[PDB]
Protein backbone atom coordinates (compact mmCIF):
# COMPACT_ATOMS: atom_id res chain seq x y z
CA UNK A 1 0.00 0.00 0.00
CA UNK A 2 1.49 2.72 -1.52
CA UNK A 3 2.16 6.35 1.08
CA UNK A 4 0.42 9.42 -0.34
CA UNK A 5 -0.32 13.38 0.44
CA UNK A 6 -3.42 14.58 -0.57
CA UNK A 7 -2.74 17.35 -3.05
CA UNK A 8 -3.70 20.72 -2.16
CA UNK A 9 -2.64 24.06 -1.77
CA UNK A 10 -1.99 26.26 0.98
CA UNK A 11 -5.44 28.10 0.80
CA UNK A 12 -7.23 24.46 0.49
CA UNK A 13 -5.71 23.47 3.81
CA UNK A 14 -7.58 23.93 7.21
CA UNK A 15 -4.91 24.40 10.61
CA UNK A 16 -5.03 21.25 12.82
CA UNK A 17 -5.10 23.24 16.26
CA UNK A 18 -7.78 26.24 15.14
CA UNK A 19 -10.72 25.83 12.58
CA UNK A 20 -9.22 28.21 10.26
CA UNK A 21 -7.15 28.25 6.82
CA UNK A 22 -3.57 27.75 6.90
CA UNK A 23 -1.80 31.47 5.94
CA UNK A 24 1.57 30.40 5.37
CA UNK A 25 4.71 28.22 5.91
CA UNK A 26 7.13 29.39 8.71
CA UNK A 27 10.29 27.75 10.17
CA UNK A 28 11.33 28.48 13.64
CA UNK A 29 14.72 28.45 14.95
CA UNK A 30 15.46 26.16 17.17
CA UNK A 31 14.71 27.11 21.02
CA UNK A 32 14.81 25.58 24.27
CA UNK A 33 10.68 26.19 24.86
CA UNK A 34 9.30 22.48 23.84
CA UNK A 35 6.80 21.67 20.90
CA UNK A 36 4.03 19.32 22.61
CA UNK A 37 0.64 20.23 20.82
CA UNK A 38 -1.99 17.80 21.57
CA UNK A 39 -4.11 18.26 18.63
CA UNK A 40 -3.28 17.93 14.88
CA UNK A 41 -0.59 14.94 15.83
CA UNK A 42 -1.26 11.69 13.61
CA UNK A 43 1.30 9.17 12.72
CA UNK A 44 1.85 8.78 9.15
CA UNK A 45 0.15 5.15 9.01
CA UNK A 46 -2.73 7.20 10.45
CA UNK A 47 -2.92 6.48 13.84
CA UNK A 48 -4.62 9.86 15.74
CA UNK A 49 -2.84 10.80 19.19
CA UNK A 50 -3.40 13.31 21.69
CA UNK A 51 -6.45 14.94 21.53
CA UNK A 52 -6.69 14.90 18.21
CA UNK A 53 -9.99 14.10 15.87
CA UNK A 54 -11.28 14.54 12.42
CA UNK A 55 -13.62 17.09 12.06
CA UNK A 56 -12.11 20.72 11.26
CA UNK A 57 -15.55 21.68 13.62
CA UNK A 58 -14.30 19.68 16.52
CA UNK A 59 -11.00 21.71 16.88
CA UNK A 60 -11.11 23.70 20.00
CA UNK A 61 -15.12 23.04 20.10
CA UNK A 62 -17.11 21.56 23.62
CA UNK A 63 -20.30 19.57 23.73
CA UNK A 64 -21.96 18.92 26.71
CA UNK A 65 -24.72 20.27 29.41
CA UNK A 66 -24.65 23.39 32.05
CA UNK A 67 -25.47 22.24 35.16
CA UNK A 68 -24.32 24.87 37.63
CA UNK A 69 -22.76 28.07 38.56
CA UNK A 70 -20.42 29.99 40.82
CA UNK A 71 -19.56 32.69 42.15
CA UNK A 72 -16.26 33.27 40.08
CA UNK A 73 -15.26 34.91 37.20
CA UNK A 74 -15.31 31.28 35.14
CA UNK A 75 -19.06 31.38 36.16
CA UNK A 76 -21.11 28.43 34.10
CA UNK A 77 -19.94 25.27 34.81
CA UNK A 78 -19.95 22.89 31.60
CA UNK A 79 -20.52 19.10 32.15
CA UNK A 80 -18.60 17.84 28.91
CA UNK A 81 -19.75 14.79 26.51
CA UNK A 82 -17.72 13.75 23.81
CA UNK A 83 -18.00 15.97 20.86
CA UNK A 84 -20.46 13.58 18.91
CA UNK A 85 -22.71 13.06 21.77
CA UNK A 86 -22.02 10.02 23.33
CA UNK A 87 -20.74 10.05 27.40
CA UNK A 88 -17.22 11.29 28.43
CA UNK A 89 -14.99 8.66 29.64
CA UNK A 90 -12.46 10.02 32.51
CA UNK A 91 -10.31 7.07 32.43
CA UNK A 92 -10.13 6.68 28.86
CA UNK A 93 -6.40 7.27 27.29
CA UNK A 94 -6.20 10.57 26.18
CA UNK A 95 -5.43 13.99 27.92
CA UNK A 96 -8.61 15.34 27.55
CA UNK A 97 -11.64 15.27 25.27
CA UNK A 98 -10.65 14.91 21.87
CA UNK A 99 -11.13 18.95 20.19
CA UNK A 100 -10.12 20.61 23.88
CA UNK A 101 -7.38 23.21 23.01
CA UNK A 102 -4.09 22.40 23.56
CA UNK A 103 -2.61 25.95 24.76
CA UNK A 104 -2.59 28.34 27.17
CA UNK A 105 -5.12 31.20 26.86
CA UNK A 106 -8.42 32.21 26.19
CA UNK A 107 -10.85 31.05 23.83
CA UNK A 108 -13.56 33.16 22.56
CA UNK A 109 -16.51 32.14 20.92
CA UNK A 110 -19.99 31.59 21.14
CA UNK A 111 -22.28 29.53 23.05
CA UNK A 112 -25.64 28.14 21.96
CA UNK A 113 -28.27 26.15 23.71
CA UNK A 114 -31.18 23.76 22.50
CA UNK A 115 -33.32 22.68 25.48
CA UNK A 116 -34.73 19.09 26.05
CA UNK A 117 -36.93 17.28 28.44
CA UNK A 118 -39.77 19.14 30.19
CA UNK A 119 -38.41 22.81 30.44
CA UNK A 120 -39.83 24.68 26.65
CA UNK A 121 -38.35 22.12 24.62
CA UNK A 122 -37.13 22.75 21.62
CA UNK A 123 -36.13 26.46 23.19
CA UNK A 124 -32.93 28.29 22.07
CA UNK A 125 -30.47 31.07 22.57
CA UNK A 126 -26.67 31.88 21.47
CA UNK A 127 -24.46 34.35 23.08
CA UNK A 128 -21.13 35.30 22.98
CA UNK A 129 -18.66 33.39 25.21
CA UNK A 130 -15.13 32.96 26.74
CA UNK A 131 -13.51 29.39 27.91
CA UNK A 132 -10.09 30.29 29.69
CA UNK A 133 -7.55 27.25 29.62
CA UNK A 134 -5.70 29.42 32.75
CA UNK A 135 -8.89 28.71 34.93
CA UNK A 136 -9.04 26.40 37.50
CA UNK A 137 -12.09 25.58 36.32
CA UNK A 138 -11.12 24.36 33.32
CA UNK A 139 -10.47 20.62 33.81
CA UNK A 140 -11.73 18.88 30.84
CA UNK A 141 -9.87 15.61 32.14
CA UNK A 142 -12.31 15.62 34.92
CA UNK A 143 -15.26 16.13 32.67
CA UNK A 144 -15.77 19.68 32.52
CA UNK A 145 -15.30 23.47 31.83
CA UNK A 146 -16.39 26.37 33.26
CA UNK A 147 -17.82 29.54 31.03
CA UNK A 148 -17.73 33.22 30.77
CA UNK A 149 -20.78 34.72 29.15
CA UNK A 150 -21.31 38.42 28.01
CA UNK A 151 -25.76 38.01 29.84
CA UNK A 152 -25.85 35.70 32.77
CA UNK A 153 -29.56 36.49 32.77
CA UNK A 154 -30.48 34.14 29.58
CA UNK A 155 -28.75 31.01 29.92
CA UNK A 156 -29.74 27.46 31.51
CA UNK A 157 -28.66 24.32 32.58
CA UNK A 158 -29.62 22.80 29.20
CA UNK A 159 -27.44 21.13 26.46
CA UNK A 160 -24.86 23.40 25.27
CA UNK A 161 -22.04 23.87 22.62
CA UNK A 162 -19.31 25.72 22.52
CA UNK A 163 -18.21 27.51 18.82
CA UNK A 164 -14.74 28.71 18.91
CA UNK A 165 -13.73 31.96 16.67
CA UNK A 166 -10.14 32.97 17.99
CA UNK A 167 -8.56 33.37 21.06
CA UNK A 168 -6.96 35.91 23.00
CA UNK A 169 -4.55 37.04 25.74
CA UNK A 170 -6.41 37.24 28.91
CA UNK A 171 -6.86 40.25 29.95
CA UNK A 172 -5.60 40.33 33.61
CA UNK A 173 -1.77 39.32 32.15
CA UNK A 174 -2.16 35.80 31.34
CA UNK A 175 -0.65 35.38 28.39
CA UNK A 176 -1.83 33.43 25.08
CA UNK A 177 1.25 30.73 24.85
CA UNK A 178 0.25 28.41 21.42
CA UNK A 179 3.10 25.56 22.66
CA UNK A 180 2.40 26.03 26.56
CA UNK A 181 -0.18 22.97 27.73
CA UNK A 182 -2.83 23.65 29.98
CA UNK A 183 -3.67 21.74 33.05
CA UNK A 184 -6.25 19.19 31.89
CA UNK A 185 -7.11 18.28 34.88
CA UNK A 186 -6.27 21.22 37.18
CA UNK A 187 -3.91 23.10 39.63
CA UNK A 188 -1.31 20.94 41.09
CA UNK A 189 -1.86 17.48 38.21
CA UNK A 190 -0.06 16.93 35.84
CA UNK A 191 -1.03 15.89 31.99
CA UNK A 192 -1.38 12.42 30.97
CA UNK A 193 -1.25 10.15 27.80
CA UNK A 194 -0.25 13.12 26.02
CA UNK A 195 1.25 12.68 22.67
CA UNK A 196 5.11 12.89 22.50
CA UNK A 197 7.30 16.44 22.51
CA UNK A 198 8.54 16.80 18.86
CA UNK A 199 12.14 18.61 17.98
CA UNK A 200 14.18 18.08 15.03
CA UNK A 201 17.86 16.17 15.98
CA UNK A 202 19.64 16.36 13.05
CA UNK A 203 22.24 19.47 13.01
CA UNK A 204 21.11 22.40 10.80
CA UNK A 205 17.42 21.01 10.52
CA UNK A 206 14.68 23.16 12.11
CA UNK A 207 10.49 22.82 12.19
CA UNK A 208 8.30 23.57 9.69
CA UNK A 209 5.15 24.63 10.54
CA UNK A 210 1.86 25.26 8.84
CA UNK A 211 0.97 28.68 10.04
CA UNK A 212 -2.57 30.74 10.38
CA UNK A 213 -3.33 34.10 11.56
CA UNK A 214 -6.30 33.46 13.70
CA UNK A 215 -9.09 36.14 14.67
CA UNK A 216 -8.32 38.15 18.33
CA UNK A 217 -10.97 39.87 20.16
CA UNK A 218 -8.65 42.90 21.69
CA UNK A 219 -5.57 44.30 21.36
CA UNK A 220 -2.54 43.37 18.84
CA UNK A 221 -1.94 39.86 19.21
CA UNK A 222 -0.75 38.30 16.15
CA UNK A 223 -3.05 35.01 16.50
CA UNK A 224 -0.02 33.38 15.52
CA UNK A 225 -1.36 29.25 15.91
CA UNK A 226 1.18 27.05 14.14
CA UNK A 227 0.25 23.31 13.20
CA UNK A 228 2.29 20.49 13.05
CA UNK A 229 0.94 18.62 9.33
CA UNK A 230 -2.62 20.04 8.23
CA UNK A 231 -6.16 19.01 8.83
CA UNK A 232 -6.84 17.23 5.65
CA UNK A 233 -3.20 15.40 5.55
CA UNK A 234 -4.48 13.85 9.26
CA UNK A 235 -7.23 13.01 7.61
CA UNK A 236 -5.83 11.64 4.56
CA UNK A 237 -3.57 9.34 6.79
CA UNK A 238 -6.03 7.82 8.80
CA UNK A 239 -7.94 6.59 5.36
CA UNK A 240 -5.41 5.28 4.10
CA UNK A 241 -3.37 3.83 6.69
CA UNK A 242 -0.04 2.96 4.46
CA UNK A 243 2.21 1.45 6.28
CA UNK A 244 5.34 3.56 7.02
CA UNK A 245 8.28 2.32 5.41
CA UNK A 246 11.27 4.05 7.07
CA UNK A 247 11.19 6.82 10.16
CA UNK A 248 11.27 9.21 7.46
CA UNK A 249 9.43 10.54 4.19
CA UNK A 250 11.45 12.28 1.92
CA UNK A 251 8.76 15.28 0.39
CA UNK A 252 9.05 17.85 -2.11
CA UNK A 253 7.59 21.11 -2.17
CA UNK A 254 6.42 20.96 -6.36
CA UNK A 255 5.20 24.23 -8.74
CA UNK A 256 2.63 22.39 -10.84
CA UNK A 257 2.23 24.54 -13.16
CA UNK A 258 6.26 24.82 -13.75
CA UNK A 259 6.69 21.35 -12.75
CA UNK A 260 9.82 22.23 -10.56
CA UNK A 261 10.78 21.29 -7.21
CA UNK A 262 11.28 24.31 -5.07
CA UNK A 263 12.59 23.08 -2.01
CA UNK A 264 12.70 19.73 -0.42
CA UNK A 265 11.64 18.25 3.53
CA UNK A 266 11.26 15.48 6.17
CA UNK A 267 7.83 14.19 6.99
CA UNK A 268 8.80 12.05 9.81
CA UNK A 269 6.89 8.84 10.94
CA UNK A 270 5.32 10.25 14.04
CA UNK A 271 3.59 13.70 11.98
CA UNK A 272 6.40 16.22 12.02
CA UNK A 273 8.74 18.10 9.17
CA UNK A 274 12.10 19.41 9.25
CA UNK A 275 13.74 21.31 7.16
CA UNK A 276 17.34 22.71 6.65
CA UNK A 277 17.66 26.23 7.56
CA UNK A 278 19.18 28.05 10.13
CA UNK A 279 16.81 31.04 11.27
CA UNK A 280 12.99 31.91 11.48
CA UNK A 281 12.07 32.41 7.95
CA UNK A 282 8.60 32.82 6.65
CA UNK A 283 8.78 31.05 3.29
CA UNK A 284 8.28 32.64 0.09
CA UNK A 285 6.26 30.22 -1.91
CA UNK A 286 4.36 30.46 -4.78
CA UNK A 287 0.61 30.20 -4.36
CA UNK A 288 -0.20 27.15 -6.46
CA UNK A 289 2.57 24.89 -4.30
CA UNK A 290 1.90 21.79 -2.66
CA UNK A 291 3.96 18.83 -1.07
CA UNK A 292 4.54 15.48 -3.25
CA UNK A 293 6.02 12.18 -1.43
CA UNK A 294 9.37 11.18 -2.85
CA UNK A 295 10.37 8.12 -1.16
CA UNK A 296 11.46 6.18 1.90
CA UNK A 297 14.61 7.98 3.61
CA UNK A 298 15.94 7.74 7.37
CA UNK A 299 17.05 10.04 9.89
CA UNK A 300 20.54 10.44 8.51
CA UNK A 301 19.15 11.95 5.14
CA UNK A 302 21.24 15.04 4.39
CA UNK A 303 18.48 17.55 2.77
CA UNK A 304 19.39 20.42 0.46
CA UNK A 305 19.39 23.56 2.32
CA UNK A 306 16.08 25.79 1.97
CA UNK B 1 -11.28 3.37 -9.55
CA UNK B 2 -14.08 5.14 -8.08
CA UNK B 3 -14.63 5.12 -4.24
CA UNK B 4 -15.97 6.70 -1.08
CA UNK B 5 -13.63 7.58 2.08
CA UNK B 6 -14.90 5.47 4.72
CA UNK B 7 -16.41 7.61 7.69
CA UNK B 8 -19.36 7.22 9.90
CA UNK B 9 -21.81 9.66 10.49
CA UNK B 10 -20.47 11.33 13.08
CA UNK B 11 -17.14 11.64 11.16
CA UNK B 12 -19.23 13.61 8.47
CA UNK B 13 -19.12 17.32 7.92
CA UNK B 14 -22.58 19.11 7.18
CA UNK B 15 -21.15 20.43 3.05
CA UNK B 16 -24.20 23.52 3.86
CA UNK B 17 -23.10 24.08 7.42
CA UNK B 18 -19.85 23.56 9.38
CA UNK B 19 -21.25 21.09 11.75
CA UNK B 20 -21.42 17.46 11.94
CA UNK B 21 -24.04 15.33 10.02
CA UNK B 22 -27.05 13.98 12.90
CA UNK B 23 -28.15 11.77 10.48
CA UNK B 24 -30.14 10.24 7.41
CA UNK B 25 -33.24 11.69 6.30
CA UNK B 26 -35.49 10.99 2.97
CA UNK B 27 -37.79 13.20 1.89
CA UNK B 28 -41.31 12.91 0.23
CA UNK B 29 -41.29 14.35 -3.21
CA UNK B 30 -43.08 18.11 -3.51
CA UNK B 31 -43.31 20.77 -6.22
CA UNK B 32 -40.69 22.69 -4.42
CA UNK B 33 -37.29 22.18 -5.89
CA UNK B 34 -33.99 21.42 -4.53
CA UNK B 35 -31.19 23.46 -5.88
CA UNK B 36 -28.57 23.95 -2.89
CA UNK B 37 -25.84 25.90 -4.29
CA UNK B 38 -23.15 24.91 -1.43
CA UNK B 39 -22.51 21.11 -1.06
CA UNK B 40 -22.33 20.30 -4.79
CA UNK B 41 -19.83 18.12 -6.40
CA UNK B 42 -19.58 15.79 -9.41
CA UNK B 43 -18.36 12.13 -8.91
CA UNK B 44 -15.34 13.15 -11.47
CA UNK B 45 -14.44 16.17 -9.12
CA UNK B 46 -16.10 19.15 -10.14
CA UNK B 47 -17.11 20.98 -7.32
CA UNK B 48 -20.21 23.13 -8.84
CA UNK B 49 -22.17 26.42 -7.31
CA UNK B 50 -20.62 28.05 -4.46
CA UNK B 51 -18.97 25.01 -3.18
CA UNK B 52 -15.05 25.40 -2.01
CA UNK B 53 -12.99 22.44 -0.29
CA UNK B 54 -12.92 23.77 3.50
CA UNK B 55 -15.65 23.04 5.98
CA UNK B 56 -14.49 26.89 7.28
CA UNK B 57 -15.50 28.25 4.20
CA UNK B 58 -19.25 27.32 4.47
CA UNK B 59 -21.24 30.43 5.58
CA UNK B 60 -18.23 32.48 6.13
CA UNK B 61 -17.28 35.83 4.17
CA UNK B 62 -13.78 37.52 4.20
CA UNK B 63 -13.64 41.57 3.01
CA UNK B 64 -13.22 45.04 3.76
CA UNK B 65 -15.88 47.21 5.78
CA UNK B 66 -16.00 50.16 4.08
CA UNK B 67 -19.12 52.05 4.74
CA UNK B 68 -22.13 52.02 6.87
CA UNK B 69 -25.93 53.50 6.05
CA UNK B 70 -28.86 53.96 7.93
CA UNK B 71 -30.62 50.56 7.53
CA UNK B 72 -31.05 47.84 9.89
CA UNK B 73 -28.10 45.82 7.68
CA UNK B 74 -25.71 49.25 8.78
CA UNK B 75 -22.37 47.89 7.86
CA UNK B 76 -21.28 47.64 3.90
CA UNK B 77 -18.40 44.36 4.25
CA UNK B 78 -16.79 44.77 0.36
CA UNK B 79 -16.12 41.21 0.09
CA UNK B 80 -12.96 38.62 -1.06
CA UNK B 81 -12.30 35.54 -1.99
CA UNK B 82 -12.35 33.30 1.48
CA UNK B 83 -8.30 32.94 0.55
CA UNK B 84 -7.96 36.87 0.45
CA UNK B 85 -7.93 37.58 -2.93
CA UNK B 86 -9.68 39.81 -4.78
CA UNK B 87 -13.15 39.05 -6.33
CA UNK B 88 -13.96 38.71 -9.47
CA UNK B 89 -18.36 39.76 -10.27
CA UNK B 90 -17.27 38.64 -13.61
CA UNK B 91 -16.41 34.98 -12.80
CA UNK B 92 -19.04 31.89 -13.66
CA UNK B 93 -20.46 31.24 -10.11
CA UNK B 94 -23.51 32.21 -8.39
CA UNK B 95 -21.55 34.23 -5.44
CA UNK B 96 -18.47 34.24 -4.09
CA UNK B 97 -17.51 30.81 -2.81
CA UNK B 98 -18.91 29.88 0.65
CA UNK B 99 -22.00 32.30 0.26
CA UNK B 100 -24.83 30.87 2.15
CA UNK B 101 -27.55 29.05 -0.27
CA UNK B 102 -30.70 29.79 1.55
CA UNK B 103 -33.20 32.46 2.98
CA UNK B 104 -32.86 32.84 6.41
CA UNK B 105 -30.07 35.02 9.29
CA UNK B 106 -26.86 33.48 9.75
CA UNK B 107 -25.83 34.43 12.83
CA UNK B 108 -21.94 34.09 14.23
CA UNK B 109 -19.23 36.76 14.94
CA UNK B 110 -17.50 39.48 12.84
CA UNK B 111 -13.77 39.72 13.90
CA UNK B 112 -11.39 42.45 12.56
CA UNK B 113 -7.37 43.13 12.38
CA UNK B 114 -6.26 46.77 11.00
CA UNK B 115 -3.98 46.92 8.04
CA UNK B 116 -2.14 50.15 6.85
CA UNK B 117 -1.24 53.50 8.72
CA UNK B 118 -4.16 53.35 11.38
CA UNK B 119 -3.30 50.84 14.25
CA UNK B 120 -2.20 48.47 12.19
CA UNK B 121 -2.50 45.03 13.98
CA UNK B 122 -5.30 46.61 16.36
CA UNK B 123 -8.26 43.76 16.39
CA UNK B 124 -11.80 43.37 17.49
CA UNK B 125 -14.47 41.34 17.78
CA UNK B 126 -18.19 40.83 18.37
CA UNK B 127 -21.75 39.17 17.80
CA UNK B 128 -23.19 39.77 14.36
CA UNK B 129 -25.86 38.46 11.51
CA UNK B 130 -26.12 38.29 8.14
CA UNK B 131 -29.61 38.29 6.88
CA UNK B 132 -30.07 37.12 3.06
CA UNK B 133 -33.27 38.32 2.71
CA UNK B 134 -31.92 41.77 3.02
CA UNK B 135 -31.65 44.07 0.02
CA UNK B 136 -28.26 44.59 0.48
CA UNK B 137 -27.26 41.28 0.66
CA UNK B 138 -26.09 41.48 -2.75
CA UNK B 139 -22.89 38.90 -2.54
CA UNK B 140 -22.36 37.87 -6.43
CA UNK B 141 -22.05 42.12 -6.84
CA UNK B 142 -19.39 41.58 -3.82
CA UNK B 143 -20.83 43.14 -1.19
CA UNK B 144 -23.28 41.73 2.03
CA UNK B 145 -24.27 44.38 4.59
CA UNK B 146 -23.93 43.43 8.44
CA UNK B 147 -25.87 43.86 11.72
CA UNK B 148 -23.96 43.76 14.42
CA UNK B 149 -23.99 44.47 18.67
CA UNK B 150 -21.97 47.43 19.54
CA UNK B 151 -21.80 50.18 16.58
CA UNK B 152 -19.58 52.28 18.15
CA UNK B 153 -16.39 49.56 18.38
CA UNK B 154 -15.93 48.67 14.60
CA UNK B 155 -13.76 50.18 11.44
CA UNK B 156 -13.48 50.52 7.93
CA UNK B 157 -10.60 47.45 8.13
CA UNK B 158 -10.89 43.68 7.08
CA UNK B 159 -13.32 41.59 8.21
CA UNK B 160 -14.25 38.16 9.10
CA UNK B 161 -17.32 36.65 9.63
CA UNK B 162 -17.80 33.53 11.54
CA UNK B 163 -20.65 31.63 11.20
CA UNK B 164 -22.20 29.50 14.00
CA UNK B 165 -26.15 29.24 13.34
CA UNK B 166 -28.84 30.06 11.70
CA UNK B 167 -32.42 31.56 12.59
CA UNK B 168 -36.09 32.83 11.40
CA UNK B 169 -35.10 37.03 10.95
CA UNK B 170 -38.39 38.57 12.63
CA UNK B 171 -41.37 40.19 11.44
CA UNK B 172 -42.27 37.06 8.90
CA UNK B 173 -38.68 36.14 6.98
CA UNK B 174 -38.57 32.78 8.27
CA UNK B 175 -35.23 30.02 7.57
CA UNK B 176 -35.94 28.35 4.41
CA UNK B 177 -33.08 25.91 3.41
CA UNK B 178 -34.45 25.34 0.12
CA UNK B 179 -35.39 28.95 -1.06
CA UNK B 180 -32.27 30.53 -2.61
CA UNK B 181 -31.60 34.10 -1.53
CA UNK B 182 -31.44 36.87 -4.54
CA UNK B 183 -27.14 36.51 -4.76
CA UNK B 184 -27.35 39.72 -6.72
CA UNK B 185 -30.03 43.32 -5.95
CA UNK B 186 -34.46 42.10 -6.17
CA UNK B 187 -35.50 41.61 -9.76
CA UNK B 188 -32.16 39.92 -10.94
CA UNK B 189 -31.85 36.26 -11.36
CA UNK B 190 -29.71 34.37 -9.78
CA UNK B 191 -26.79 32.61 -12.46
CA UNK B 192 -24.52 29.34 -12.82
CA UNK B 193 -26.30 27.63 -10.56
CA UNK B 194 -25.57 24.06 -9.59
CA UNK B 195 -28.69 22.41 -11.44
CA UNK B 196 -31.57 21.37 -9.87
CA UNK B 197 -31.95 17.86 -8.15
CA UNK B 198 -34.87 15.53 -8.52
CA UNK B 199 -35.69 11.75 -8.58
CA UNK B 200 -36.53 10.65 -11.90
CA UNK B 201 -37.45 7.16 -11.25
CA UNK B 202 -40.88 6.24 -9.94
CA UNK B 203 -40.56 4.96 -6.48
CA UNK B 204 -37.37 6.90 -5.94
CA UNK B 205 -36.52 10.24 -3.05
CA UNK B 206 -33.94 12.15 -2.32
CA UNK B 207 -31.52 10.66 0.67
CA UNK B 208 -30.00 13.53 2.42
CA UNK B 209 -27.38 14.23 5.43
CA UNK B 210 -29.28 15.99 8.24
CA UNK B 211 -27.51 18.41 10.71
CA UNK B 212 -29.77 20.17 13.60
CA UNK B 213 -27.76 23.15 13.90
CA UNK B 214 -27.71 25.51 16.73
CA UNK B 215 -30.41 28.65 16.73
CA UNK B 216 -30.45 31.99 18.34
CA UNK B 217 -33.63 32.08 20.16
CA UNK B 218 -37.24 30.62 19.61
CA UNK B 219 -38.07 26.81 18.59
CA UNK B 220 -36.61 26.51 15.12
CA UNK B 221 -35.11 22.78 14.79
CA UNK B 222 -32.13 24.61 12.94
CA UNK B 223 -32.54 21.49 9.91
CA UNK B 224 -29.80 21.50 7.11
CA UNK B 225 -30.24 18.94 4.92
CA UNK B 226 -26.90 18.66 2.24
CA UNK B 227 -27.04 15.97 -0.61
CA UNK B 228 -23.36 14.60 0.08
CA UNK B 229 -21.04 15.70 2.85
CA UNK B 230 -17.95 17.99 2.73
CA UNK B 231 -15.51 15.08 3.16
CA UNK B 232 -16.89 13.54 -0.20
CA UNK B 233 -16.36 16.23 -2.14
CA UNK B 234 -13.30 16.42 -0.30
CA UNK B 235 -12.36 12.80 -1.65
CA UNK B 236 -13.94 12.83 -5.56
CA UNK B 237 -11.76 16.25 -6.12
CA UNK B 238 -8.55 14.38 -5.11
CA UNK B 239 -9.58 10.87 -7.16
CA UNK B 240 -11.44 12.88 -10.02
CA UNK B 241 -12.17 8.90 -10.87
CA UNK B 242 -14.05 9.21 -14.10
CA UNK B 243 -17.39 8.32 -13.74
CA UNK B 244 -18.71 4.81 -15.80
CA UNK B 245 -21.92 5.81 -15.70
CA UNK B 246 -24.61 7.69 -14.27
CA UNK B 247 -25.18 6.16 -10.98
CA UNK B 248 -22.59 4.33 -8.92
CA UNK B 249 -24.62 2.08 -6.61
CA UNK B 250 -23.87 2.13 -2.94
CA UNK B 251 -24.59 -0.19 0.00
CA UNK B 252 -25.02 1.32 3.47
CA UNK B 253 -23.06 -1.73 5.60
CA UNK B 254 -22.55 -2.17 9.03
CA UNK B 255 -19.19 -3.26 9.24
CA UNK B 256 -19.00 -5.65 11.75
CA UNK B 257 -21.53 -7.54 10.99
CA UNK B 258 -20.72 -7.65 7.92
CA UNK B 259 -24.05 -7.11 6.32
CA UNK B 260 -25.74 -4.50 3.43
CA UNK B 261 -28.39 -2.78 4.84
CA UNK B 262 -29.81 -0.81 2.25
CA UNK B 263 -29.21 0.26 -1.04
CA UNK B 264 -28.62 3.55 -2.51
CA UNK B 265 -27.89 5.52 -6.45
CA UNK B 266 -25.15 8.04 -6.44
CA UNK B 267 -25.78 9.84 -9.55
CA UNK B 268 -22.73 11.21 -11.62
CA UNK B 269 -23.52 14.81 -10.07
CA UNK B 270 -23.89 14.43 -6.86
CA UNK B 271 -26.95 13.62 -5.11
CA UNK B 272 -28.28 10.44 -3.38
CA UNK B 273 -31.52 8.41 -4.45
CA UNK B 274 -33.03 5.63 -2.37
CA UNK B 275 -36.86 3.62 -2.92
CA UNK B 276 -39.19 5.06 0.02
CA UNK B 277 -42.30 6.77 0.07
CA UNK B 278 -42.48 9.58 2.77
CA UNK B 279 -40.60 11.36 4.77
CA UNK B 280 -38.34 9.11 7.11
CA UNK B 281 -35.58 9.76 9.14
CA UNK B 282 -33.23 7.12 9.04
CA UNK B 283 -32.81 4.99 12.44
CA UNK B 284 -29.00 2.92 11.42
CA UNK B 285 -26.38 1.69 13.66
CA UNK B 286 -23.86 4.27 14.72
CA UNK B 287 -20.80 2.30 12.83
CA UNK B 288 -22.44 2.73 9.37
CA UNK B 289 -21.21 3.64 6.32
CA UNK B 290 -21.72 3.94 2.72
CA UNK B 291 -19.53 1.27 0.10
CA UNK B 292 -19.66 1.69 -3.61
CA UNK B 293 -21.08 -1.29 -5.26
CA UNK B 294 -20.35 -0.57 -8.96
CA UNK B 295 -21.72 1.35 -12.37
CA UNK B 296 -25.47 0.94 -12.93
CA UNK B 297 -27.88 3.73 -14.83
CA UNK B 298 -30.50 5.42 -14.43
CA UNK B 299 -32.99 2.30 -15.04
CA UNK B 300 -31.59 0.16 -11.98
CA UNK B 301 -34.42 -1.14 -9.41
CA UNK B 302 -33.55 -0.24 -5.81
CA UNK B 303 -34.10 -3.03 -3.46
CA UNK B 304 -37.01 -1.01 -0.91
CA UNK B 305 -35.10 1.11 2.08
Avoid at 53 to 76: E, Y
Wanted: net charge negative; with cysteine; charged share 15%.
Amino acid sequence: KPFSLPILTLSELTNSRFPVPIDSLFTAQNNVLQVQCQNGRCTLDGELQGTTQLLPSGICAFRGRVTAQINQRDRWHMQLQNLNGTTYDPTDDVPAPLGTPDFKGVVFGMVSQRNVGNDAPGSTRAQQAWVSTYSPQFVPKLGSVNLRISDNDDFQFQPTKFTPVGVNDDDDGHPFRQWELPNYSGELTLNMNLAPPVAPNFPGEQLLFFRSFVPCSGGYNQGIIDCLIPQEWIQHFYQESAPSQSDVALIRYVNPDTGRTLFEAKLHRSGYITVAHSGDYPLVVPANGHFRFDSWVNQFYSLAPM
